[PDB]
Design goal:
The structure is cut from a larger assembly and holds one copy of chain A and two copies of chain B. Helices cover 31% and strands 0% of the residues of chain A. By secondary structure, chain A is mostly helical. Classes of the chains: A mainly alpha, B mainly alpha. Chain A: This is Sodium-dependent neutral amino acid transporter B(0)AT1.
């Protein structure tokens, strides 16, 4: 919706890619300026660490995804 | 127009001194020269080509006003986008629906049907390249002097023996075989300057950007993301929240100009000009003077004006300055001092 | 739209001052030289009587001279 501007209600992790086809169909020019960051589970499960990072630079992140984040 | 067509090539004969010396005016001391006619076609291009889209739109702007497809809040609205579309000229100052600068001319202010210039323009160029080679005198090509040359006028006489016996495209085919019109003799006498527009205008930039203005630089794009601060379960932004905003924009100037500029100037929400309304509550805006609308507020002071009351407006819509995006204005705060 | 030579942008002939390689030589410079040559509204037609007969096309009569 940055460059191609749909209403914020009618966009979700959905036909986003299908509406992207309508965005590229309505215009390819501004469509060639909007970079999208492709993502995947097992592109987020494929990163790991061993030895020390699991509790020191990995677990403490999901600690901060808690409503009582200093307590846990 | 027809009359004007043959009449202003006869007002051309009023503008030539060639038969004036042979109908009894001033003696020649001003004999003509050679080269100019390769660059005289340039001078015709500033006159006859410069007026073609301008005089077209104002009649077309008048008609959709006249048949009532343009409501009476849309005149200066409809006046300028076609000057950007058809002419590619822009206004140097934005105009509200009070000014009516179409009325500033002669013929709109005094009721003339202004399409009379196009008909005469079309028939005029179909004639001249097809006839006056046999006008018995051609030095300079504008000296097709039918005065002392009968022979060319008798091919012209096939239209001249007629009144309103019928339409004019039969009078057109009495001369050059024209049946509706042709834009080709326009294109043909500018065909030496069609390619010459790739001689001194070879270095190519095609078209124009159809939305630039010299005041577009002072407009600020504001970008609202309701799915970022309030997220979901939030209220649906509509034209009220448009109207809430411009009131709260007008806020920021009053708070600026008396706490910083320190004199009172009044502001309505209508001074906050709204352009390119998008669902994502995104639009480029700028503010003007209240009703000295010839002059607008310089953006350089608006940038500090927002940064003074930036904290005022996010909680005016439950937002977080990442849903108050300004693209040139960003929050510069937050030093922490937790330890004693 | 204030850079076109005129007020409303019709004729750009006064922009022929910086857009030229060349071009010179004026047209009739006798625009007031008939004012003191003094052909009135019927001597201009007595002279234009000879204008179009050299084109061969006829001239105007019957009211063109009389009632006016």
């Amino acid at each position: 919706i940055n460059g191609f501007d749909l209403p914020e209600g009618n966009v979700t992790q959905e036909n986003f890619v299908d509406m992207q086809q309508r965005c590229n169909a309505s215009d390819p020019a501004a469509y060639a300026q909007l970079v999208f960051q492709t993502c995947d589970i097992n592109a987020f499960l494929s990163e790991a660490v061993e030895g020390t990072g699991l509790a020191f630079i990995v677990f403490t992140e999901a600690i901060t995804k808690m409503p009582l984040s200093p307590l846990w | 127009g027809f009359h004007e067509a043959v009449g202003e090539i006869m007002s051309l004969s009023a503008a030539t001194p060639k038969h004036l010396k042979s109908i009894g005016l001033l003696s020649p001391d001003f004999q003509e020269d050679n080269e100019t006619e390769i660059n005289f076609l340039l001078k015709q291009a500033l006159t006859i080509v410069g007026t073609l889209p301008f005089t077209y739109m104002l009649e077309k702007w008048r008609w959709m006003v006249f048949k009532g497809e343009i409501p009476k809040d849309q005149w200066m609205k409809k006046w300028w986008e076609m000057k950007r579309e058809i002419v590619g000229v822009v206004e140097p100052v934005p105009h509200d629906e009070t000014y009516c600068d179409p009325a500033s001319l002669f013929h709109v202010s005094n009721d003339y049907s202004f399409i009379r210039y196009y008909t005469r323009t079309l028939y005029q160029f179909q004639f001249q390249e097809a006839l006056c080679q046999a006008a018995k005198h051609e030095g300079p090509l504008h000296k097709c002097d039918i005065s002392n040359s009968t022979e060319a006028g008798q091919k012209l006489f096939n239209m001249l023996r007629l009144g309103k016996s019928e339409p004019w495209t039969l009078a057109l085919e009495n001369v050059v075989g024209a049946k509706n019109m042709n834009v080709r003799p326009l294109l043909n006498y500018f065909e030496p300057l069609f390619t010459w527009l790739k001689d001194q205008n070879k270095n190519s930039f095609v078209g124009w950007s159809t939305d630039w203005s010299p005041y577009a630089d002072q407009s600020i794009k504001v970008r609202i993301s309701l799915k970022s601060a309030l997220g979901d379960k939030a209220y649906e932004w509509n034209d009220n929240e448009m109207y809430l905003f411009r009131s709260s924009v007008a806020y920021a100037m009053r708070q600026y100009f008396l706490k910083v500029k320190n004199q009172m100037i009044l502001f309505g929400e209508e001074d906050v000009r709204v352009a390119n309304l998008k669902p994502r509550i995104s639009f480029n805006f700028f503010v003007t003077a209240p009703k000295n609308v010839s002059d607008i507020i310089p953006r350089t002071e608006v940038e500090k004006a927002i940064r003074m009351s930036r904290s005022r407006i996010n909680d005016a819509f439950r937002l977080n300055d990442n849903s108050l995006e300004f693209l040139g204005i960003q929050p510069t705060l937050g030093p922490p001092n937790q330890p004693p | 739209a204030h850079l076109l030579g005129d007020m409303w942008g019709r004729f750009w002939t006064n922009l022929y001052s910086l857009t030229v390689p060349f071009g010179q030589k004026p047209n009739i410079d006798v625009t007031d030289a008939m004012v003191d040559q003094a052909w009135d509204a019927q001597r201009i037609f007595k002279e234009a009587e000879k204008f179009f007969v050299s084109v061969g096309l006829p001239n105007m009569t019957q009211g063109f001279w009389e009632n006016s």
